[PDB]
Symmetry: D2
């Protein structure tokens, strides 16, 4: 018969079903940075890409496939049809609009809510037991939207949130102190956006509180202008957008970071978007970033961070901003 038959004696065949499948919805720069990052961290036995643009989708899939020799993910598939998404453990949504230069993420809300009305039911149809990781902006509101639409328990709907903001924060912290970001600790919580809250009280190296060493830290009076580090965090996205048109690599790595914790059930702590109703006097169904324990069931636990009254005030302000938009939605 065939060359294959001359060479290989077959015992089995289909031997099917993926055990560790990840789907990325959206093959824009963000989606593909998530894809490459996940492929190179060996988090998946199958990667599925979905988009509406069929030419781009096939091209992206093929480009990844041509590099298969150098990867350890044996199955890469794509399709407009969500059936390619079946039995995903983790589905990452990166599809939607995306802010231009000067544009608030909050300005994307109605466009991307409409998109989610199509995407989320289709994802859920084919992977009912998946975790949903929302990356599309505004991520905090859209996490809430994905939660309402999907009907999933809240532990299985995670927004990428301030994982990236905190990463940026720690990078800049490290630059100032001459320490690798890995050894620089500090949390940016709340909205992934303009109303993010830097937790000065928590900033530390080797367990040494920076606010203790330097009480002016985070105030306007601060001779060292540490408040500017947070300002740079807020402005990062806009500045990168200004310079190169979009952001991709940082968010990609950030998402693979979250994927790693979920897929490997690490129970690491990440600042990600989740429902915070009942904390810090928030009474509504607001989603924003707090430190959460991430594992194979998604968010199993929240860390109840202690905030200064001002830090708490800023977080309540973030909550209000978000709830203001959320309440007007048809989810």
């Amino acid at each position: 018969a065939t060359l294959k038959d001359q060479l290989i004696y077959n015992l089995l065949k289909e031997e099917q079903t993926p055990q560790n499948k990840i789907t990325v919805v959206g093959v824009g720069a963000v989606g593909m940075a998530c894809a490459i990052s996940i492929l190179m961290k060996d988090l998946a036995d199958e990667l599925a890409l979905v988009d509406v643009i069929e030419d781009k989708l096939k091209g992206e899939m093929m480009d990844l496939q041509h590099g298969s020799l150098f990867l350890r993910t044996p199955k890469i598939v794509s399709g407009k049809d969500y059936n390619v998404t079946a039995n995903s453990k983790l589905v990452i949504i990166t599809a939607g609009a995306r802010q231009q230069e000067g544009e608030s993420r909050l300005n994307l809300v109605q466009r991307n809510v409409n998109i989610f009305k199509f995407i989320i039911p289709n994802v859920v149809k084919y992977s009912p037991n998946c975790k949903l990781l929302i990356v599309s902006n505004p991520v905090d509101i859209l996490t809430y939207v994905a939660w309402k639409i999907s009907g999933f328990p809240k532990n299985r709907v995670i927004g990428s949130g301030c994982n990236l903001d905190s990463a940026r924060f720690r990078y800049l912290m490290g630059e100032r102190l001459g320490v690798h970001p890995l050894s620089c600790h500090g949390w940016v919580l709340g909205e992934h956006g303009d109303s993010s809250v830097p937790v000065w009280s928590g900033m530390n190296v080797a367990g040494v509180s920076l606010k203790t060493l330097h009480p002016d830290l985070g105030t306007d009076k601060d001779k060292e202008q540490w408040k500017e580090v947070h300002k740079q965090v807020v402005e990062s996205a806009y500045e990168v957008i200004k310079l190169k048109g979009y952001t991709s690599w940082a968010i990609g790595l950030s998402v693979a970071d979250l994927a790693e914790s979920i897929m490997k059930n690490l129970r690491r702590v990440h600042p990600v978007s989740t429902m915070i109703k009942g904390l810090y006097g928030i009474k509504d169904d607001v989603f924003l970033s707090v430190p959460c324990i991430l594992g194979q069931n998604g968010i199993s636990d929240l860390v109840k961070v202690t905030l200064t009254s001002e830090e708490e005030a800023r977080l309540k302000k973030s909550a209000d901003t978000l709830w203001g938009i959320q309440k007007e939605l048809q989810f």
Copy 2:
């Protein structure tokens, strides 16, 4: 005193001189795919990016920097000035014009030769002992150009060549046979382009010659049309370009593959562009892809592949095509 000084007592100033520095010239899609791939394989203690477009360059650098928390490359720098490139072990050139839909890589020659006249002397100025890895197209001619311009010994000028073509070939081989590409062996040699030569005689799984099993393999008579696999290899770049506008991920991974062998002195065998004068009756200073041993001195050795008379004829044809263009290059 500053917070840094309050917190940290310094013994030593200046983390002086990079030990494992890689430079990527060109921050187009290819350059940045090389960058991310190298960053995630931990091949460098310092990554430098260089381009002429200053806004894009700074934006790319910053995007990578924001993800520092998730990498183990502590220093990422960029600049128009080649002084950011100093003391590189490996310099990867991805700058230049790239082919549009329908356009032969050979059509880029004069534009990219002009570019290389600027780039190569600047690279050499700041990293005289580096290895040059040429990725810009047409890679085989431009490797020769980089060799002439740099004045480097031929072992330190390497073209990415058919590393990717072979990777694609093995992917497709694997698809047909139901085997991981890692276990599918087969070489595409010669021009990284239309005149590439698939070495049917060398195609094997588990040491079993496929041509032995199936003598029609590679010919027009072949009922199974294995020739079409090489068909797909030649046309890959064009089809991906057609679908998504460019290729990035596969070439990126391919380049990191080569970088890994160089940086870690693996002495693995890769089909890369090098001078083949004196082999297969080629008498001119032609560069094309043959299997080479890659390590910390670049190409230390060539494998002298045995070719069928036809396979050799195809390689001589590839050589002629390339030499035809090479001879005209007064640059």
Copy 3:
């Protein structure tokens, strides 16, 4: 009330099915080398160790646990009771007697068959859908034993076989040729032991047949004495045993190599102990090493290597030796 409760909320409690669990039976040098190798390749979300020596077992578990900060396997458990083994994807058997200086692996047969009569039913009880990877010696016979005892289909019973022999072979090949073993190809098949068969016909670098270049390769007349490379393969175990008392690291890495292909469903080709009946005129239920495709269902396929009449004669001889012992087996 507790600090844990003050700090950490809880959305989701009971949970607890492992998705990617590996069990290692036997915490001798081999077992623990398998354990460390698997832990550092991130192949498992849970590692279980089982042995009969309770003090040693607990000590080993604890030592690994103390290094948890530096691993990505969140759950390490041990116990005499096989209930710690439940829901393993892959169970690696390394328990039993091992050969002393001068002792043939075939001399371990009755002792280890008796051991397997206890081990295998217990493994199967708690992980009925696992793949069994047999490492205990003589691995080829004991793979057959594990197959008979377990009642598993033959695809889910894999002996580590000649994966290590081939690895050694390629190392030595590489030493002689000045090439990384990764780029040196050559298969040692049959018994993991004295009657192993080096497939000279398949030995190649970059697809170039070494036997073609050097027809004396593998014969006694060979001026270069390539036969000695195989002799060194056969004698490796004995020489290492002579020098340090046992072998551990190489077999450990070899086993993690196989585990990687199984867990990640790579469909890579490895020379491992399996069913062979119906190939090369073998008519009995002999298990020995041939190149097999390894994935999430274990051995899905065998590669039908072409052998010289002598290579085939040697493999039939290996088969006879093994069958001679197998037929006499006392369960």
Copy 4:
């Protein structure tokens, strides 16, 4: 012509000089756990092993070499002669006596000081610009000894110190809290031994001070008995020794962790043995563990941790114990 010449055409001859060489002195369980850990983290282009026991040494080398197929370290060498050590970037000393069950590490001092009088000058002879990483016990005193003997600047003499103690601490912290150790923060400083100091003030998850949440933390009055976590840290080594005869895996991983920071110039913070004269009112040349910034020049910086008066008292006590022994040392 030889087979080598038929197969390989040579461009380049001598090749050589290691760029990223690591030496491990001592091939006891600790030495070899360091070796395997380093080999699997790809930290070295060359690994050298040295010991006095020639049979064991050769056996260990060979066992690692046989697994070369599965590693990316192309050169593994061993020898009694320290010339195999030449041009190491990092030399890890694990040779010497180790403690028995119930035996204080401080009881090893004179035996291992004598050993160091031979080892250290030989290491320095062949790798004058290396970093010395001392693992032999008592590590704090022996770091001081290696510093005095070598004549190196203090930044290039590093004791593994409390990197492991802190790792154990964080593991146990994580066990109690249901969080991965990576997300559990807490430092054990001072002597790697009975007089280690747990920094209760610094213990945190997600930046939330545990002592703030639970003021009894670390006291005897503590209902939750967190003091027992530290007691378990002190007793770990002894309990593992009691159970399996020695410790290997945890210290191995801990050492590779430090090696990673040094080789890749990460500037991560690790609690390692260094000279602390001038801190916490210590006036003598005492070495003990404080958080240090680790990179390619070794210890570039110390973090000046803020301690409670009691925590500081405990550290001064640790310092006194160590200085008591150090002052008596003769050369």
